[PDB]
Design a protein around this nucleic acid. Structure first.
Ligand code: ZN
Lengths: 252, 91, 135, 30, 77, 52, 97
RNA sequence: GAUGGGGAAGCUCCGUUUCAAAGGCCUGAUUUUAUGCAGGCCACCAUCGAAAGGGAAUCCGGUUAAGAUUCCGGAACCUGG
RNA sequence: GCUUGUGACGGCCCGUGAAAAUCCACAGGAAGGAAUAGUUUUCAUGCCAGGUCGUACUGAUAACCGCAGCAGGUCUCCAAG
RNA sequence: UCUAAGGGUCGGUACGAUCAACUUAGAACUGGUACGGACAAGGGGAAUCUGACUGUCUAAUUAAAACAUAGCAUUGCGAUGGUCAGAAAGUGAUGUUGACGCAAU
RNA sequence: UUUACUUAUUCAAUGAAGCGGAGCUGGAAUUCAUUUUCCACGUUCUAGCAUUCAAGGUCCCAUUCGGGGCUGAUCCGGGUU
C-alpha cells in the first residue's frame, strides 16, 4: 500500500505550525529569588491578539532585580485584566485576579489558570480560552496540591507550582457556528495544514484502511487496539465505549 | 422604517446556512457589535476588536474579556468567589 | 484658604521647566493687562547642583554645587503647589514686574537670586528645594 | 432636514418663515 | 538656487575668495498694471550653490555694476 | 534625521522629542504625589508600632 | 443619606461642577467641601486630596460613579467632582460628612 | 547551513544557541617604542537567503548610424574624511 | 469626469493582517572645560574622495519555451475623443 | 419646439439681480406606426429524482448525484502523555501547543 | 514484598543570583528555674522614578586633584537549583 495521511504528519514538511505572526511563546516569569520569597510588581502595558490562538495575550513588564533594565514578559490575559493594572507575582502576592501565586499559598476552591505542572516550567495547564482549574483541598505534609483539570481529571502536583488567578479570557468562542468553510479556512490558515479533511472511507485501499469497495463502508470494526501499528491506527483508537450515551456527563 | 422581521443583522447571509444556525449567530453578533460601559471612565465607548480584547474608544483602557461579550457569566461568578475568599485572609 | 503666597514652593508642570521646583514671590491673584489670568512671579532652579561626596575636594565641590536660577511668570494652572515653604524676603525686591520689559534687568535679577540660592544650599537650608525631581 | 423634511432649498426657507411666524404670534398673546 | 534680497551682503558674496564668475541677466518684464520696465538679475556662482539678486529698479542697476570688483569675470547676458 | 539640525527633532522641555507634553505633566504630578505620599507613608508607620 | 442633602445645596446654595473649576475655587479658598465620584481616576483623586489638604477643605467620597453623581446634583451630564462654596438650608457642612 | 558536540562500518546524519574556557569596544597610561599594560563595560554568540520586501543621495535641456537619470552643458544632493 | 496619490473615517474577522539592518530622540550626569581668555565642526561657508559588476536589443502571430520564422503557452506599467 | 423643478458668489426686518451644472418630469407638433432603428442585449412556466448552498478533481474521452463543506457525533491523551517521523542519536513533527487544545474517525 | 540513602543513571531550569545550616532582632507562645518550643524578620489606593565597583558612618594614604579597607548588606559550607 501507500503511506497514509496521518503517518506523513510526523515528517514535518507542510504540516508544521504557521508561526510568522505569533507574538512569542506565552510563558510565566522565570522562578527566581524574588518570587519564592516575596513578590514582584509588573505593569500590563498592552493586551494584544495572538495569531492562531483563541485567547488574547498580555505583555507585562518587570524590573530586572540584578541589572538596570526592563524585562517584558508574555502572559496569557485573564478576564478582568486591563492595561496599566499592577500585576503581583510571587509567594506573598495578594489573592487578586491577574496575580501569580504558588498553589500552596491559595485557599481551597480558588480558580486559577496557566498552571505549572512542575515548578519552573512556566505554565502547562488551564491555558486555552475560557479554561480554569479548581483548587480542591491541600496537603501540608508531603506538599502537594490537588486540582480539578478542565477535562475533569483529578491531578496531584507540587505546592510550589505557580498559577495565575482567574479564568483565561476569550471564553465562549466555540459557541458560535462558523457557518461556512471560508471562515473555517482562515481559522486553520494560521495554525497548520489540517483542513480540509477527506474521509478515509471515500479513499482507495492504498490511501486508507477504510478505502476501497463498491460501497462506502469501513468493512471491519473501527475500534483500533492501543497496541496497534502506525498505519493501522485509523478511526477510534483504544475505545472503551462507542455510540451515543443516553444520559448526562460531568461525573461527580 | 423596520426593514426585516426577524433576521436582523443576519440578513446579510440571505437564505443560506439554515434558520436555526443563523438565529444563534444573531444572538452573538449583536453582543459582539454592541457598545458597553467603561468601568473606569463611565462612557458608553467600549467596543470589540480581536475577540477577547475590548478597547474603550476614548480613555485608552483595554480590558480582556470574553469572545463576544465584555463580561462572561462564568467569569462573573469567578470574580465573586475570588473576591469572597479574599476577606478570609485579612479577617 | 489662600495658600498661594510668597512663602510656598511650587512645581512647574508645563514648558521648559516641567518637573522643576520654584518659589512664588509676587502672586497676582486676579487681573493684569499683559496677563488676563491668575499668575505669579516665581524663581526656580534651572540646573540643580550635582551629587557631591566627601571624596571630592575643594575644586569640584565648588563646581558640582553651581546653581543656575531662572525667573518666570507662570499661570496658576501650570503650577503644582507644595506644603513646603522658602524664605523669600532675601530676594523679594530684586524681582518684580519691571525686571522684565527691557530684559536687561533680568540678568541683574538672576545674579541676586543665584547667590541667595547658593548660600541657602550652604548650611543645610531647605534641602528638599535643591533636590532635583526624578520622573 | 437630516431625515428628509425638506425636498429642496425653497421648502426650507418657507418652513423658516412659517415657523418664525408661529414664534412671534404666540409671543403677542403672552 | 538661492535668492538674495539685501544688497550689502551681496557684495560680500563677490569677495568670498572662492567665487570666480558672475553673470548679469537683463529681462524685459511688465509692470503690475502699467508700462514695461528693465529688470536685471545679478548671479554669483559659488562653489556649492548659485546666488541671485533680482533688482527691479534700473537706477540701482547701473550703480551696482560700478561696485563690482575688477577681479570678477562678469558675463553680460 | 541625521542630516537635519537638532531643533527639528526635539523641543525645549524634559522628555522633549519623546513624549506628547501631556503624559509629561501626568508623570510629574504622579511623581510628586506618590513620593509625597511615600514620606507620609513612613511617618504613619514610624509610631504605629511604637504605640502598641 | 447624602442624596437629599445634595438636593438642598443645588436650589438654596451656590456650588461648582467639574474638575478645572473645583481647583480654581480651591486655590481661592472659596470651597467648603468637595465631593469626589468613586470612578474618578486615582491620580486626579489624589491631586484633589492634596489640594484640599493645603486649603484645609473636607473631602467626601461619593458612593457612586460620575454617572450618578450628576444625577444627585440634578444634571443630565456626568460630574466627576462637586465643589460646595456656600451651603443653603442643608446641614451637609455640619453632618458627619 | 558551518562551529561546539552527539550519531553512523562509512559515504555522511542530527542540530543552530544548541550540556563550550565560544570576544573586541572605548580608551587611558607611554614621551626608552611601539601599541605593553592598567579599570570599567557589553554576552548579542558563524554565514547564506529578495535585481517585485527593507534601503543614504539627480534633475532638466542637448547629443549617436546604433549608448545615456551613465555622455556634454547647466543646476543639485548624500556619504566618508 | 478618467487615472493616480493622499487625508480623516466607517464596515469585516474564532483571519486583527512580516522581520532585520539602519537612523534619530529622550532619560541619565561620566568626563572635559572660561575672563587678559578658553570652550563649538547637529549654525553658515570653504577643501578632498566616492571603487567593483550590470547597462546594446527583443520581450513575442519572427529575437523566450514548444524539433520551426508553430493561430499554442508566458509576469507587469503607461491608457485620447 | 417649448414648459416646470433641482444651484453658487457679493450687501440680508424694503430679497430683486447676476454666473455656473446635466438630472428629472410634463405639453404640443411631426413621419410610409417608425423610434434600446447598427452595435449591444434574460426564453418562460408546471413538476419529479438528486446533492443543502459558494467551492474542488480525473492536464490530453468521464465536472457529476462524486470530493470538500458548515453542522452533528464518537474516540485517544494532563507531558515520565496522545498521534506520527528517524539507520541511529545529547534526534524530530503537532508544539511559539495544553482539553473552548491537539490527534484519530 | 515494602521502605530508606549520600552518587551511578534519568528529567527540567537558569547569560548556573541568593541553596543548606547556624545566629541575631521582635512577637505569637508557657515558663514551674530558663527559654524545654514556633513563625515572621524593608516593596499593594496611582501606567512617575530606581544604573556610574553607593551615599552615609568609621578607619588608612602622605594631602593634592584623589586612592584603599570595615560597615551599610549577620556568619559558616564552595553541592548552580
Ligand atoms: Zn473609558
Amino acid at each position: 500500500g501507500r503511506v497514509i495521511r496521518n503517518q506523513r504528519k510526523g515528517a514535518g514538511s507542510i504540516f508544521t505550525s504557521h508561526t510568522r505572526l505569533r507574538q512569542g511563546a506565552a510563558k510565566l516569569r522565570t522562578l527566581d529569588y524574588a518570587e519564592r520569597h516575596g513578590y514582584i510588581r509588573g505593569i500590563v502595558k498592552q493586551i494584544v491578539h495572538d495569531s492562531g490562538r483563541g485567547a488574547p495575550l498580555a505583555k507585562v513588564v518587570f524590573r530586572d532585580p540584578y541589572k538596570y533594565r526592563l524585562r517584558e514578559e508574555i502572559f496569557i490575559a485573564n478576564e478582568g485584566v486591563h492595561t496599566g493594572q499592577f500585576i503581583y507575582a510571587g509567594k506573598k502576592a495578594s489573592l487578586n485576579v491577574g496575580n501569580v501565586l504558588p498553589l500552596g499559598s491559595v485557599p481551597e476552591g480558588t480558580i486559577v489558570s496557566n498552571v505549572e505542572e512542575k515548578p519552573g516550567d512556566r505554565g502547562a495547564l488551564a491555558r486555552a480560552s475560557g479554561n480554569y482549574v479548581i483548587i480542591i483541598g491541600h496537603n501540608p505534609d508531603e506538599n502537594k496540591t490537588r486540582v480539578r483539570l478542565p477535562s475533569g481529571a483529578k491531578k496531584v502536583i507540587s505546592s510550589d507550582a505557580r498559577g495565575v488567578i482567574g479564568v483565561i479570557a476569550g471564553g465562549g468562542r466555540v459557541d458560535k457556528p462558523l457557518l461556512k468553510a471560508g471562515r473555517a479556512f482562515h481559522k486553520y490558515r494560521l495554525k497548520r495544514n489540517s483542513w480540509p479533511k477527506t474521509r478515509g472511507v471515500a479513499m482507495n485501499p492504498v490511501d486508507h484502511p477504510h478505502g476501497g469497495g463498491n460501497h462506502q463502508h469501513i468493512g471491519k470494526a473501527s475500534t483500533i487496539s492501543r497496541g496497534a501499528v502506525s498505519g493501522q491506527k485509523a478511526g477510534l483508537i483504544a475505545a472503551r465505549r462507542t455510540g451515543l450515551l443516553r444520559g448526562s456527563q460531568k461525573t461527580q | 422604517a423596520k426593514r426585516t422581521k426577524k433576521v436582523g443583522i443576519t440578513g446579510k447571509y440571505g437564505v443560506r446556512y439554515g434558520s436555526s444556525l443563523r438565529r444563534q449567530v444573531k444572538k452573538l453578533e449583536i453582543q459582539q457589535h454592541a457598545r458597553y460601559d467603561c468601568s473606569f471612565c463611565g462612557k458608553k465607548t467600549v467596543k470589540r476588536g480581536a475577540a477577547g480584547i475590548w478597547t474603550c474608544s476614548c480613555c485608552k483602557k483595554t480590558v480582556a474579556g470574553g469572545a463576544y461579550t465584555v463580561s462572561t457569566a462564568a467569569a462573573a461568578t469567578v470574580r465573586s468567589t475570588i473576591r469572597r475568599l479574599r476577606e478570609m485572609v485579612e479577617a | 484658604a489662600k495658600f498661594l503666597k510668597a512663602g510656598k514652593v511650587a512645581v512647574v508642570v508645563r514648558g521648559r521647566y516641567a518637573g522643576k521646583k520654584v518659589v512664588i514671590v509676587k502672586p497676582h491673584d486676579e487681573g493684569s493687562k499683559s496677563h488676563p489670568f491668575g499668575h505669579a512671579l516665581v524663581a526656580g532652579i534651572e540646573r540643580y547642583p550635582l551629587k557631591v561626596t566627601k571624596k571630592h575636594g575643594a575644586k569640584k565641590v565648588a563646581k558640582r554645587t553651581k546653581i543656575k536660577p531662572f525667573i518666570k511668570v507662570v499661570n496658576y494652572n501650570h503650577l503644582l503647589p507644595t506644603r513646603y515653604t522658602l524664605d523669600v524676603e532675601a530676594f523679594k525686591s530684586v524681582v518684580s514686574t519691571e525686571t522684565f520689559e527691557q530684559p536687561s534687568q533680568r540678568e541683574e535679577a538672576k545674579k541676586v537670586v543665584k547667590k541667595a540660592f547658593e548660600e541657602r544650599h550652604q548650611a543645610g537650608k531647605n534641602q528638599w528645594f535643591f533636590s532635583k525631581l526624578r520622573f | 432636514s437630516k431625515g428628509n423634511a425638506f425636498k429642496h432649498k425653497r421648502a426650507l426657507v418657507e418652513h423658516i418663515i412659517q415657523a418664525k411666524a408661529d414664534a412671534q404670534r404666540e409671543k403677542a398673546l403672552n | 538656487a538661492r535668492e538674495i534680497t539685501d544688497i550689502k551682503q551681496f557684495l560680500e558674496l563677490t569677495r568670498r575668495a572662492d567665487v570666480k564668475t558672475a553673470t548679469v541677466k537683463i529681462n524685459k518684464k511688465l509692470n503690475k498694471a502699467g508700462k514695461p520696465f528693465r529688470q536685471t538679475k545679478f548671479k554669483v556662482r559659488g562653489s556649492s550653490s548659485l546666488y541671485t539678486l533680482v533688482i527691479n529698479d534700473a537706477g540701482k542697476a547701473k550703480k551696482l555694476i560700478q561696485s563690482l570688483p575688477p577681479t570678477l569675470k562678469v558675463n553680460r547676458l | 534625521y541625521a542630516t537635519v539640525s537638532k531643533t527639528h527633532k526635539t523641543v525645549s522641555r524634559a522628555y522633549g522629542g519623546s513624549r506628547c507634553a501631556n503624559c509629561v505633566k501626568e508623570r510629574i504630578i504622579r511623581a510628586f504625589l506618590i513620593e509625597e505620599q511615600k514620606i507620609v507613608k513612613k511617618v504613619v508607620k514610624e509610631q504605629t508600632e511604637a504605640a502598641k | 443619606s447624602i442624596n437629599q442633602k445634595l438636593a438642598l445645596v443645588i436650589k438654596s446654595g451656590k456650588y461648582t461642577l467639574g474638575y478645572k473649576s473645583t481647583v480654581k475655587s480651591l486655590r481661592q479658598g472659596k470651597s467648603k467641601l468637595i465631593i469626589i465620584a468613586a470612578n474618578t481616576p486615582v491620580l486626579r483623586k489624589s491631586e484633589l486630596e492634596y489640594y484640599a489638604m493645603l486649603s484645609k477643605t473636607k473631602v467626601y467620597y461619593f458612593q457612586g460613579g460620575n454617572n450618578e453623581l450628576g444625577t444627585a446634583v440634578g444634571k443630565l451630564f456626568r460630574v466627576g467632582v462637586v465643589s460646595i462654596l456656600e451651603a443653603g438650608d442643608s446641614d451637609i457642612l455640619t453632618t458627619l460628612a
